[PDB]
Antibody
Framework: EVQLVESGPGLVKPSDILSLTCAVS?????????WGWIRQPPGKGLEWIGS???????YYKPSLESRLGISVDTSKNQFSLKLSFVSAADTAVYYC?????????????????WGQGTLVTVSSASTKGPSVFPLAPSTAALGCLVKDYFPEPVTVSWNSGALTSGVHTFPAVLQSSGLYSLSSVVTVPSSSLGTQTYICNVNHKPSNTKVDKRVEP | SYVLTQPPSVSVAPGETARISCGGN??????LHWYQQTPGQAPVLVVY???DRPSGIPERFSGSNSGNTATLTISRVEVGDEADYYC???????????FGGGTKLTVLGQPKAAPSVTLFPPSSEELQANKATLVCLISDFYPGAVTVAWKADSSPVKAGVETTTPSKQSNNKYAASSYLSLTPEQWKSHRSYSCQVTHEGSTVEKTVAPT
């Protein structure tokens, strides 16, 4: 019933400020709990960042305190993160989480409800939307190549979501150029190739790119 | 700052009991909490206050804490329990939360599975745009490592090759992909190109040719 959702830019230039907002649903921040942020750089462990109470009282990770601000807006049931002077070390998935005070005597907090997380990449490179190419079938495998985009992520659906079974969307490769590419492939009955239309729907939010590419035999 | 030490990896046979340690100076004096994280998803609280379970967490998950080491115990381990597990405390002396470095749980006994390889040639559209990419998609393999080699006719090619790390498919098998960037002239001047995927000593090769 309690849900948290992170939002904000997915790309920040080095030395600028990374800003995120967490919208809470199912519980009023004004009523209780601490509310805070945890991040995870790609392939690494969890790192706690900081938290805030509805009164405005905060706890900040000491190593980040000089660069950190956390704010709360009880009127909008949201709280926010600002991390200044960022570098590539700050590229990470950022989670917001409810911080529960333990009933034990000594002060203790644990994190019982988490948002899904949002990726922020720190880079000087410009946003670039993908070029989308059809991967024609010779059952049959067909797909779409989503080429040369930045930054992550990209979403792919098939037939506006009507086609889900047999879909395998692969994790992107990061090229030496600094751009990403990924592919999505679907396995379909060979029998259906003349009668069924197949379109991959590609969405790259950072560049506001929306591409529908029909894949023909 | 207070330090929590976890082993990077623990392996256990299915149905057996997995024990994941979390070491810290006098950790027994602090309450300890634990999280499970599946590749690609947010962590989930599985134990708090040393040994209590949130509603919905199976009774198979239990915790203990005394002296200089705490333990997450998972009884009757299932392949579905494969995940990274993190311990966590609140350090009162510095007002911050500390995590251990995480422990990856592996469940043994999973059968070897050879990769499925699908290789696509450059699209007409891409060739029209004066570029060419061969796409080698590799799926359903276990254990989770392959090596990929490309050939132009019979000549190994390394230039222009970009290959991903392996990723977990949630059916607990693994996937990866490899891309070969060519000029349209390179594509046209060979009879074929091959993507060769080696997995546990066995090579699966797929080949495409200009049509």
């Amino acid at each position: 019933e309690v849900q948290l959702v992170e939002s904000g830019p997915g790309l920040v230039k080095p030395s600028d400020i990374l800003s995120l907002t967490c919208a809470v649903s199912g519980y009023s921040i004004s009523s209780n709990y601490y509310w805070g942020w945890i991040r995870q750089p790609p392939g690494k462990g969890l790192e706690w960042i900081g938290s805030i109470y509805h009164s405005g009282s905060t706890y900040y990770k000491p190593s980040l305190e000089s660069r950190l601000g956390i704010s709360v807006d009880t009127s909008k049931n949201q709280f926010s993160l600002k991390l200044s002077f960022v570098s590539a070390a700050d590229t990470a998935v950022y989670y917001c989480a409810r911080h529960v005070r333990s009933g034990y005597p000594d002060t203790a907090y644990y994190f019982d409800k988490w948002g899904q997380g949002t990726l922020v990449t720190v880079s000087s490179a410009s946003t670039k939307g993908p070029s989308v190419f059809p991967l024609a079938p010779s059952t049959a495998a067909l797909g779409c190549l989503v080429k040369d985009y930045f930054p992550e992520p990209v979403t792919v659906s098939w037939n506006s979501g009507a086609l889900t079974s047999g879909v395998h969307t692969f994790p992107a490769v990061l090229q030496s150029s600094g751009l990403y590419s990924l592919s999505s492939v679907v396995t379909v009955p060979s029998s259906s190739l003349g009668t069924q239309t197949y379109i991959c729907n590609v969405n790259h939010k950072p560049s506001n790119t929306k591409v529908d590419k029909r894949v023909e035999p | 700052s207070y330090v929590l030490t976890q082993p990077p990896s623990v392996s256990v046979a299915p149905g057996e009991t997995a024990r994941i340690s979390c070491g810290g100076n006098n950790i027994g004096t602090k309450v300890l909490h634990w999280y499970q994280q599946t590749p690609g998803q947010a962590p989930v609280l599985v134990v708090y206050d040393d040994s209590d379970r949130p509603s919905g967490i199976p009774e198979r998950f239990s915790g203990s804490n005394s002296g200089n080491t705490a333990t997450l115990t998972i009884s009757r381990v299932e392949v579905g329990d494969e995940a990274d597990y993190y311990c966590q405390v609140w350090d009162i002396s510095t007002d911050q939360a500390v995590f251990g470095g995480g422990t990856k749980l592996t469940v043994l006994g999973q059968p070897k599975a050879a990769p499925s390889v699908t290789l696509f040639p450059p699209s007409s559209e891409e060739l029209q745009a004066n570029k060419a990419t061969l796409v080698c998609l590799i799926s359903d393999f276990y254990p989770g490592a392959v090596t990929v080699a490309w050939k132009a006719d019979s000549s190994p090619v390394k230039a222009g090759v970009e290959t991903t790390t392996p990723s977990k498919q949630s059916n607990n098998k693994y996937a990866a992909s490899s891309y070969l960037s060519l000029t349209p002239e390179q594509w046209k001047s060979h009879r074929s190109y091959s993507c060769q995927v080696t997995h546990e000593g066995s090579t699966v090769e797929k080949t495409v040719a200009p049509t």
